[PDB]
Ligand binder design. Structure first.
Ligand SMILES: CCn1cc(NC(=O)C2CCC2)cn1
Length: 171
């Protein structure tokens, strides 16, 4: 059975219990913590690409109001985000299972750009999701996994200094 797990879940849970925030810039900003996934149960010899996208967790705008995050009252349907291809893709099952698959080079932006950078809406809450795509073979296959532990609000600057402090303490 194909098993997908989150590396460093206990750290992600520290961020999550404060409401995690990720900075977005015009040119795009890398994530901290980095999404790292433990994968087992692949065919060592089969061919796979690792894809990353961000699901709008709800249809609302969020605002930091008197030291706490609160959703607006005006739901807007959230278009799905663009997909980031892990740069080691495409690659053998063995490659993907020998060390945690680390998305250290994805950059989160607030502006439509050449591409590579993933555009998110500022003050929307996001749930990271991967797709493991079996490629090359006749029969294609996808397996998808969400990481609730890694939810965050996209922000142009940090609102909760408790987050600012955790980011510095562990980077
Ligand atoms: C990072 C190098 N790279 C990989 C691709 N495309 C794929 O792997 C396709 C299989 C479905 C997505 C394009 N560039």
């Amino acid at each position: 059975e194909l098993r997908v797990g989150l590396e460093e879940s206990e750290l992600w849970l520290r961020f999550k219990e404060l409401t995690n925030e990720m900075i977005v810039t015009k040119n795009g900003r890398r994530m901290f913590p980095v999404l790292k996934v433990n994968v087992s149960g692949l065919d060592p010899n089969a061919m796979y690409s690792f894809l990353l996208d961000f699901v709008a967790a709800d249809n609302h705008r969020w605002k930091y109001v008197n030291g706490e995050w609160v959703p607006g009252g005006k739901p807007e349907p959230q278009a799905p985000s663009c997909v980031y291809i892990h740069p080691d893709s495409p690659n053998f099952g063995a490659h993907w299972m020998k060390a945690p698959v680390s998305f250290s080079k994805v950059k989160l932006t607030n502006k439509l750009n050449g591409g590579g950078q993933i555009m998110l809406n500022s003050l929307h809450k996001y749930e990271p999701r991967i797709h493991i795509v079996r490629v090359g073979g006749p029969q294609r296959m996808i397996t998808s996994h969400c990481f609730p532990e890694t939810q965050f609000i996209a922000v142009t600057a940090y609102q909760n200094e408790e987050i600012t402090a955790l980011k510095i303490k562990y980077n």
